[model samples]
Target: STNDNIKDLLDWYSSGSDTFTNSEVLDNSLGSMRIKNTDGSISLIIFPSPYYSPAFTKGEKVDLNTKRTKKSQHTSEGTYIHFQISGVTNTEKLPTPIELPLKVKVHGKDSPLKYWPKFDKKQLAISTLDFEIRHQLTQIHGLYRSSDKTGGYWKITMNDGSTYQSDLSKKFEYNTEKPPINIDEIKTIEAEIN
Candidate 1:
């Protein structure tokens, strides 16, 4: 929702820039994004443009902190930049406490740098996270589409020196839609929390 008392931002994209499509993000990998906020902090950037997001490319002197707000904004712009400036301040209250119970599970790694989220510990940090073997990740490693599904080789040894997959040779199934780790794989659950 917006206020009639608040007006849209200047037509920064209309003149010669900040259009949507194939613009670079923080990198030169062209993408499009828009933002809507301006404070005094928009200052001279060194080694600008690709060094920053595409939004910082066109060096337009922005008139900031207006009562006006565009139904759309441009600070978070990407690739080829045009200017409507804002200098965001310190101590900005933002989407900080995005609290959620860490539902730890695995997935395919599309990108190169890291293990896909199911095992990576960079973007998230957890000390007491529960572990579980996800089937699709296991199935993919077996190359189920091209090869016959065999050897669901998972070694989930517990801290108490117990091996869940030692006795079973084939893969087992779990109802991912339901709660309660009532499967043989999880010998003794730590119990569900909420």
Candidate 2:
């Protein structure tokens, strides 16, 4: 899976980068990785890498966080990365957070809810229906949707105390789909992270 591959790559990169002098780090002989699937087709990458920073001991704790975001229609949304530390004496410790940057362009059809008589403006405004449909669509895509055009971030925490942060980013337009519903009378809505 792409998520697993990403996790492996990240773990390898972090370990190698952090412990440049360690032969084992150079050999990629440390750490483990995992992947998670959200409701939609998207997947998450999780990897646990031991911290070898000078501030900590050989068995000190550390954490990693990954954040992704998409900027479209003036909105931005994304996910976080989380993991736990093992093989250490301080097992109950909390993991640190990692921040990731993402720039995704989401393209999808507008909400068809407005066309449904049950959701008429008299009962619920088209904007309201649009919001509901967009929420559902985001769930289907395994991506988070925002009502505002502003950007958002997701945090991933690791078992250790160290943390990472990601920058707000947007999605590529090519990755989005045209709205399935008609928008002849509707205004273009923005999506973003809260």
Candidate 3:
């Protein structure tokens, strides 16, 4: 029943591309992927940017510029930036938890979404955001971290007390030369129930 709820929620919010128009490759500096929504009211553009390390300190900030949207009468629509951290010790080791800092700005004003949800710094572990919104409102951001890794596995517990364990060793790159680490190695953990 819980899996069904997640499936329904995902299907209701997750929409695939439906059409394309005026498709053209811009300079690599501009963007990479573009998709026309079925409603024609929104166009999604994906620009792959460089990944940075997790600082987790106060006063640390990331800056982004706004892009002009073709649909919004050429007005500058902002972008959303997200950062995810992995490779932390498991819950058995550190049950208290850790917190990361996020800062964002939009149209040169403090972001309004900053206070949407109250977060417990001791337990939160990762964060994500939409690109356009990140570019527009560059003021606020969020932090997250988890202390649930056990025996090289990360246990994701649901509200109903059901649990799923995923191998963290396969999800994170251990020998990478980068600072924040590469998340591509991490696998998506899902419910095993059928």
Candidate 4:
């Protein structure tokens, strides 16, 4: 409880090559632990990882899911739920339900990819550059990361297994000289297993 008593318990947390005996370490499912030493020693530690089921929050949210479709037609959408940061009662939310088109200039990648969804969606985390392109992952485009000394740079993979980065100036044209691939020529196969 006192400051010097505090030093006796926490001093090992900071330094010392010697290992002390640890007695009665209490842990919880919520990513927290309490350690009790020999005397009036009590230490508490917490892990901030999602794997511990506690680190997910405002900017560290996880996956979304499909709600399925009815007979007659097929659809891809969901209720788009928002979760709390735990212990916080605030349920407020902000963001979008559609993707925005971004023909960004890459100093590395010769050409830009197709329509980028949520290219400008801001969060404490990096943005994902999922898009639908006419080239469809066939040709190699020089798409690369942004040089703004920040996060959120994106790239695309080519058919030959070679990766290309985009260039700056966002000059979509000079980046790739190849004609847009045919949308009708695209083929996809999907089978749902019950």
How many clashes does each candidate structure show, in the order listed? 11, 38, 29, 25
Off by over 4 Å in 1: 1-114, 118-142, 166-194
Give the TM-score of each candidate: 0.21, 0.17, 0.19, 0.20
| Model 2 per-residue lDDT tens digits across residues 5-103 | 333323332221110011111011234322222321121221232232112233233222222222212213554332322211111221332111212
Candidate 2 Cα deviation (angstroms), residue 180: 38
> TM-score winner among the candidates?
1
Q: What lDDT score is found at residue 82 in candidate 2?
A: 29
> In candidate 3, what are the lDDT values of residues 1-194, reduced to their tens digit?
22343333233223221222222322222323222222333333333333323332222222211132222333345432222122111112223332222233322334334433322222212212122122122123221111211113233334455443433223222223122211222233221111
| Candidate 3 residue spans exceeding 4 A from truth | 1-30, 42-71, 74-115, 118-194
- Per-residue lDDT tens digits for candidate 1, residues 111-138, read 1212322321111101011212222222
TM-score of 1: 0.21
- Model 4 over residues 1-194: C-alpha lDDT tens digits? 23443333222212211112323443434654343334433333333334323233332222211111111122244222121111111122335443432343323333444533332222111111212221222122321211221112334443444433332222122212222221122222111101
